[PDB]
Amino acid sequence: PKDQRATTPYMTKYERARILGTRALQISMNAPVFVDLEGETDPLRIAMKELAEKKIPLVIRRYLPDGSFEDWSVEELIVDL
Amino acid sequence: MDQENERNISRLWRAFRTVKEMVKDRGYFITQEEVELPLEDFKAKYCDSMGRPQRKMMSFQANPTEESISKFPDMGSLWVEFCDEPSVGVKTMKTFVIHIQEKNFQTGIFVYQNNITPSAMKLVPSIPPATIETFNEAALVVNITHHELVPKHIRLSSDEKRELLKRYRLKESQLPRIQRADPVALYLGLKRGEVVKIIRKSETSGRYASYRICM
Amino acid sequence: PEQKITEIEDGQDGGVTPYSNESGLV
RNA sequence: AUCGAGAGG
DNA sequence: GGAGAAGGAGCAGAGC
DNA sequence: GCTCTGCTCCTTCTCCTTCCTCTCGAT
């Protein structure tokens, strides 16, 4: 369902790690960067900037024990940590 | 012990009290003063003038409370009786069975004096839908549910069970299990498929509820 | 959004599956 | 290639 | 070494 | 009353395993 999502609104350290990894990979594959490259050449550092600015174009499918799932977007998730 | 050595009688008395507590916990209308019967009063009421605990007189009928009924609509009457004969033979088992059949009790408890033969044991589950539970007077001397290591067990209704499984997206097989032969399961008289809510005190949180299903 | 660099031309024609690594750099 | 032995951590 | 699994054996009850 | 039909109550048997690394020296 769209609403009634029972999982946390915060981004977990595992979600953050994979988001940065997969985005950094795309960057290293010469994908378009959605933030200004302020002297940044390191895919990971670049990805972290996008994370801070919530520019990372991804959605986390959180699978629940019974096979069902809740889709949360990067923008929705609270990148605290 | 001897009639002089009333210790035997007091052991019986203890068992009697724990049965009253058990029956009460099962949801039957047992009062607090009914449970709290003094040894000398037990003797006055049940013990023969020659110092001979009239075990036959210790039998009684229990009736589910209004609250118990509202939660468990199908909960019927209970007959409790103690075996006068040291060793339980089918001749006495059948007698007990017949009593239930004639009185149409939903369930009955039969307490062993010393032991029971297989000839009787095989009869104990021969009258569906009525259920006969059995206990040994020795086992009943102490009510194990007052022990520090034993937490409060709550028998859940079929509605509570259904809601539980739905809520956690669980299948029956994914719950923690308890064997039907488990002292406490026997105390509660759990039937296969019933779920028990267990409330424990913890060190990481004040208390913690846990669910366990009867196998 | 206005960031045209976020939109894939092939994706416009349904040539990109945003939820598949087979498409790649979405 | 197996097989045993001697050691190191 | 200490399980567990398979097997022989020795008596309470029980039907003729 | 006496063998009988079950047991359940025992004794008497088969099975398994830090990590990792180095070298030599045999077949």
Q: CATH second-level architecture of B1-142?
A: 3-Layer(aba) Sandwich (3.40)
- Is the Cβ–Cβ distance between B13 and B42 less than 8 Å? yes
Residue length of chain B: 215
Q: Enumerate chain B positions whose Cβ falls within 8 A of a Cβ in A.
A: 169
Q: Which two tokens stand for residue B190?
A: 């759990």
**Inter-chain contact C26–A57, Cβ cutoff 8 Å?**
yes
Q: Where in chain B is the domain with CATH 3.40.1340.10?
A: 1-142
- Contact call for residues B65 and B26 (beta carbons, < 8 A): no
DSSP line for B96-139: HHHHHHHHT-SEEEEEESSEE-HHHHTTTT-STT-EEEEEETTT
Tell me, what amino acid is at A60?
A: I
Residue with token string 């044991």: B121
Q: Which region holds residue B27: left if phi is over 0, alpha if psi is between -120 and 50, else beta? A: left
Q: What is the CA radius of gyration of chain B?
A: 19
The CA distance from B76 to B40, in Å, is 33
* Nearest C-alpha in C relative to A60: C19
Beta bridge partners of B200: B208
Closest CA to B84 of B111, B107, B122: B111
- Minimal Cα–Cα distance from B169 to chain A, Å? 6
Q: How many residues does chain C have?
A: 26
Q: For chain A, what percentages of helix, strand and coil (3-state, to nearest 5) are there?
A: 30, 15, 55
Q: Who's near B36: CB < 8 A, 6+ residues apart?
A: B17
Structural domain boundaries enclosing A39 = 1-81
* Whether B211 contacts B197, CB under 8 Å: yes
CA separation for the pair B75, B69 (Å, rounded): 6
Work out the angle at residue B79's Cα, subtended by the Cα atoms of residues B188 and B136, and round it to the nearest 5 degrees.
60
CATH number for the domain spanning A31: value is 3.90.940.10
- Given in angstroms, what resolution was this structure solved at? 3.1
Between helix A43-52 and helix A13-28 the angle, nearest 10°, is 130
Euclidean distance between CA atoms B111 and B139, whole angstroms = 10
Backbone angles phi, psi at B82, to 5 degrees: -100, 135
One-character DSSP codes across A8-43: -SBPPHHHHHHHHHHHHHHHHTTPPPSS--SS---H
Element (H, E) at B47: strand B47-48
Distance E6 C1' – B181 CA (angstroms): 26
Judged by a CB distance cut-off of 8 A, whether residue A57 touches chain C is yes
* Token duo for residue A15: 């979600």
Cross-strand pairs, B88: B116
Q: What Å value separates CA B126 and C1' F3?
A: 29
Question: Number of C-alpha atoms within 13 angstroms, CB side, residue B20?
Answer: 18
Nucleotides of E under 7 A from a protein CB: 12-14
List the one residue out of B39, B46, B36 whose CA is nearest residue B6.
B39
**Rounded Cα distance, A37 and A46, in Å:** 7
* Residue A80 near residue A55 (C-beta atoms within 8 A): no
Q: What's the structural domain count of chain A?
A: 1
Q: Specify which residues B110 forms β-bridges with.
A: B81, B134
Distances in Å between the alpha carbon of A58 and those of A17, A25, A63, C18, C25? 13, 13, 16, 9, 12
CA→C1' distance for B179 and E4 (Å): 22
Strand partners, A63: A69
Closest chain A residue to B171, measured at CA:
A66
Long-range contacts of B71-74 (CB under 8 A, 24+ apart): B71/B27, B71/B157, B72/B27, B72/B157
Choices 1.10.1240.10, 3.40.50.300, 1.10.287.1040, 3.90.940.20: CATH for B143-215: 3.90.940.20
Block residue for tokens 């047992």: B30
SS (H, E, C) chain C: CCCHHHCCHHHHCCCCCCCCCCCCCC
Shortest distance, CA B175 to any CA of chain A (angstroms): 13
Residue B103, both tokens: 């009185």
Q: Strand B177-178's sheet: what is its strand order?
A: B152-155, B195-201, B207-214, B177-178
B189: left (phi over 0), alpha (psi -120 to 50) or beta: left
Q: Do chains B and C touch (3 or more CB pairs under 8 A)?
A: no
Query: CB of A70 within 8 A of CB of A15?
Result: no
User: Residue A47 corresponds to which tokens in the numbers above?
Assistant: 């990805």
Radius of gyration of chain C (CA): 9
Cα separation of B209 and B198, whole Å? 5
**Cα–Cα dist B8/B137, whole Å:** 11
Q: Which two tokens stand for residue B144?
A: 């194990």
One-letter amino acid at B16 equals F
